[PDB]
Structures are given as structure tokens and as C-alpha cells.
Design a protein around this ligand. Structure first.
Ligand SMILES: Cc1cccc(C)c1OCC(=O)N[C@@H](Cc1ccccc1)[C@@H](O)C[C@H](Cc1ccccc1)NC(=O)[C@H](C(C)C)N1CCCNC1=O
Lengths: 99, 99
């Protein structure tokens, strides 16, 4: 697909039975979703946004489907105002910026 | 150009004869640059994201050259952690996400 940037590039993502709306975000190093009880081990982490840092839980090797494209990798969970798909997963679905 | 996402999509911009490094950010509605002096009558503004809110100065109709592509639009100036080129200017230079 080609995705223009006239509005926020919001897409449907799927993880283990849950559907969520998430931002395709080239300015984010990693992927963060709010409110979800993922399975497995996790470790605490701090990530920086425009106003400062939030605390998140880092889950590794989590399968996620984004616009029908399968991926697997690190998913952070914490109090993000908007669900974000970051570069760690964007690369996995073959996403580039073009102009 | 095509820009991949294994690394941060940092590119050189030119504004008021100054060269700066800025992030091409599909997750940003607005363009926000680190503290600098720009001429013109700016309006005080607040923006909130991950980590909360910052105070910025909104300058309108500012020319900026992004990888040799000319844009003229709104630029926010304040204590952003990194120079950010948002969708308002990315659309002016014909930038899309593709996968
Ligand atoms: C940098 C990073 C590292 C690891 C993991 C993650 C998720 C990371 O990214 C976190 C992050 O906030 N990145 C931002 C840019 C960034 C990178 C590095 C440091 C600081 C910031 C940006 O791309 C996304 C973020 C999304 C957002 C969040 C809450 C509300 C609305 C939007 N967008 C915004 O904050 C924008 C700003 C930039 C104008 N924004 C806020 C006003 C309303 N609308 C809007 O679009």
C-alpha cells in the first residue's frame, strides 16, 4: 500500500485476539500500546516523548498483524495517549518513506 | 529519495540560512524545532504528547527546505527533544509511507 499523510496514518493491528487502532510512526524507535495483559516475561523501561518520559513494560517476540502483514518483535505496554507502531516493526513489514 | 527505517530518518533541513538535523515523523501532526530565533510575530501555544505538555511558539508561513524540497508552512519552536518535521510539511514535499 501507499499511505498519504493528509491525516494521521492510523491502521488496524491485531494481537492475540485483540484489535486496536495504531499510528504508523517513523519518529518512534519502538512500538507502544496502552492497556494489555500480554503473556510472558517483561522488563521495565522508560521511553521519551515530546513532554518527557513514561514507564512501560517491554515484551519481546510478540506476534502482531498490521494491515494483513505478519510481524513479530518487541511490544511495549504503557500509558501512551495513542497506540504507536514504531520502526522496530515498520521495518519488518517493509515500510519506507518516499518523496 | 527512499528512506528506510533501520535507523532514525534524520535528514538535513535548511531554515533561515541555518542547517539542522530533523526527524521525518509521520507520527507528528505538527513541525516542532528546538529553541531558535525566527523573525515574525509568533503565537504562544501548548502541545501535549507522550510525557505531557510543552510550551511552544507558533510561526506561520515559514520557508523550510527538506532534502532540497521546498516547503512554506507552520513551524513550532520550543523545548522539543529533537527537531521534528511533521505531516503539515511532509505532505508539502510529497512524502508518503509505502510497503
Ligand atoms: C521516540 C520513541 C522511542 C521509543 C518508543 C516510542 C514510542 C518513541 O516515540 C514516542 C513519541 O512520542 N514520538 C514522537 C516524536 C518524538 C521523538 C523523540 C522525542 C520526542 C518526540 C512522535 O513520533 C509521536 C507522537 C504521538 C502522539 C502522542 C500523544 C498524542 C498525540 C500524538 N506525536 C507527538 O507527540 C506530536 C508532536 C511531536 C507534535 N503531537 C503532539 C501534539 C498533538 N499531536 C501530535 O502529533
Amino acid at each position: 500500500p501507499q499511505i498519504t499523510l493528509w491525516k494521521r496514518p492510523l491502521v488496524t493491528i491485531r494481537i492475540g485476539g485483540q484489535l486496536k487502532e495504531a499510528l504508523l510512526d517513523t519518529g518512534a524507535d519502538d512500538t507502544v500500546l496502552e492497556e494489555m495483559n500480554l503473556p510472558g516475561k517483561w522488563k521495565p523501561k522508560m521511553i521519551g516523548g515530546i513532554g518527557g518520559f513514561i514507564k512501560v513494560r517491554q515484551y519481546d517476540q510478540i506476534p502482531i498483524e498490521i494491515c494483513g502483514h505478519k510481524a513479530i518483535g518487541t511490544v511495549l505496554v504503557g500509558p501512551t495517549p495513542v497506540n504507536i507502531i514504531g520502526r522496530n516493526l515498520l521495518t519488518q513489514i517493509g515500510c519506507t518513506l518516499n518523496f
